[PDB]
Design a protein around this ligand. Structure first.
Ligand SMILES: *[C@@H]1O[C@H](CO)[C@@H](O[C@@H]2O[C@H](CO)[C@@H](O)[C@H](O)[C@H]2NC(C)=O)[C@H](O)[C@H]1NC(C)=O
Ligand SMILES: *[C@@H]1O[C@H](CO)[C@@H](O)[C@H](O)[C@H]1NC(C)=O
Ligand SMILES: *[C@@H]1O[C@H](CO)[C@@H](O)[C@H](O)[C@H]1NC(C)=O
Ligand SMILES: *[C@@H]1O[C@H](CO)[C@@H](O)[C@H](O)[C@H]1NC(C)=O
Ligand SMILES: *[C@@H]1O[C@H](CO)[C@@H](O)[C@H](O)[C@H]1NC(C)=O
Ligand SMILES: *[C@@H]1O[C@H](CO)[C@@H](O)[C@H](O)[C@H]1NC(C)=O
Length: 364
């Protein structure tokens, strides 16, 4: 390669560095809108959760009403209920202790104590009136209300931090004066946002009440559900079915709310990833702004342009171009042989690929 050729190639390749400055600045604005867009997608998702919560809490009132209707229906349960209950508690305890020792593998004794402690402070009427499911829903409702109050407090806080950053009309040699205010705002926003058998064993750890799924295993507990109360009225089996149904509704609406929460979590994660990009982008314009101080328009210098013809170690269809960027280590870039050196795209490729290597490597 001619020496007069290299100096003109380098002089050409340095023009593509001046462009990368404007490109990196635009990339900030490209991220800026992506964040705002993602911020609007969750404001849409928030109003859906406002509505879904209303439908859920209305489905629970109807469940609480279907419950109390069954309670107030006159009539008494046969004393046989207490006889099963004393053979249902030891069966249920032994079952959950076995399951915990088998699958979960931990101290089955502690579980058995807590469960027996709960089974003595409970009545078989609780199981008969499906109180386990009723209380299960109420617990999930709190957590979903809490989990949203948590997400809403991190997001809307960071959202306001970002709504103070994006007010700057940005969206000189003394850029380090803008550098620190912007970069710290991104950090303050970032830290605001950061948060079968395996599952059941976790629920048994959280509360011994998780064992109540295994009531189906015990026969005596299954019998308790089929005892004649309400003096054997047809309204009983009618109200019991009406309760069963009003639960299914409240259970299904609780699921559909979780999927909207899991969606709200994706929005929160997505947005924190767009901040890491905005962070690394501002550290790239900072490095560029530093490295482009002065009246010098040299930034890229082509060292050697080799091929399979010259070096031979070079692969068959690439041309390895060694370059120095911003007065740093020599960088080797593989641009295809299909590209001719006459092509302005040749140095455009060398520059772009070289800027990537310097962006990832050079410590700053
Ligand atoms: C729940 O009640 C049962 C029955 O009263 C308790 O079982 C008794 O436990 C004591 C202490 O181990 C024994 O001396 C008795 O013989 C047991 N009686 C029967 C009928 O099993 C059980 O301990 C209670 N659960 C608690 C307190 O958590
Ligand atoms: C619950 O539903 C019943 C029947 O539809 C209604 O009379 C009652 O006002 C409701 N309560 C609430 C708090 O929504
Ligand atoms: C309880 O069972 C006994 C024996 O089967 C029966 O005579 C009685 O009518 C039952 N009472 C109720 C309320 O079901
Ligand atoms: C466990 O369940 C019982 C009954 O629903 C409840 O009183 C208690 O607060 C629960 N404990 C935890 C840690 O959720
Ligand atoms: C953003 O969320 C969508 C679903 O809403 C998901 O498919 C995608 O992987 C998420 N992206 C990131 C970076 O979390
Ligand atoms: C830019 O230069 C200043 C002054 O030397 C330095 O403190 C700062 O860390 C540099 N920024 C980058 C991104 O290298």
């Amino acid at each position: 390669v001619s020496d007069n050729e290299l100096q003109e190639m380098s002089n050409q390749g340095s023009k593509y560095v001046n462009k990368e400055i404007q490109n990196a600045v635009n990339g900030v604005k490209q991220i800026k809108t992506l964040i705002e867009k993602t911020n609007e997608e969750r404001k849409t998702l928030l109003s859906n959760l406002e509505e879904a919560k209303k439908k859920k809490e209305d489905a629970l009132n109807e469940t609480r009403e279907s419950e109390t209707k069954l309670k107030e229906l006159p009539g008494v349960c046969n004393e046989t209920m207490m006889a099963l209950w004393e053979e249902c508690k030891p069966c249920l305890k032994q079952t959950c202790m076995k399951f915990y020792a088998r699958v979960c593998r931990s101290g089955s004794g502690l579980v058995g104590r807590q469960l027996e402690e709960f089974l003595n402070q409970s009545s078989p009427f609780y199981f008969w009136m499906n109180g386990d499911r009723i209380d299960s829903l109420l617990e999930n409702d709190r957590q979903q209300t809490h989990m949203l109050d948590v997400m809403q407090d991190h997001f809307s806080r960071a959202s306001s931090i970002i709504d103070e950053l994006f007010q700057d009309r940005f969206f000189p040699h003394n850029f380090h004066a803008m550098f620190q205010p912007f970069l710290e705002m991104i950090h303050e926003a970032q830290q605001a946002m950061d948060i079968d058998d395996r599952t059941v064993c976790r629920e048994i750890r959280h509360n011994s009440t998780g064992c109540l799924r295994m009531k189906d295993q015990c026969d005596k507990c299954r019998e308790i559900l089929s005892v004649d109360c309400s003096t054997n009225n047809p309204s009983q089996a009618k109200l019991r079915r009406e309760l069963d149904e009003s639960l299914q509704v409240a259970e299904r609406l609780t699921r559909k709310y979780n999927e909207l929460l899991k969606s709200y979590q994706w929005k929160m994660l997505n947005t924190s990833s767009l901040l890491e990009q905005l962070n690394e982008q501002f550290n790239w314009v900072s490095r560029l702004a530093n490295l482009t101080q002065g009246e010098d328009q040299y930034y890229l210098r082509v060292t050697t342009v080799a091929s399979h013809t010259s070096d031979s170690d070079v692969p068959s269809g690439v041309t390895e171009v060694v370059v120095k960027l911003f007065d740093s280590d020599p960088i080797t870039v593989t641009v295809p042989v299909e590209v001719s050196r006459k092509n302005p795209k040749f140095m455009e490729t060398v520059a772009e690929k070289a800027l990537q290597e310097y962006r990832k490597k050079h410590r700053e």
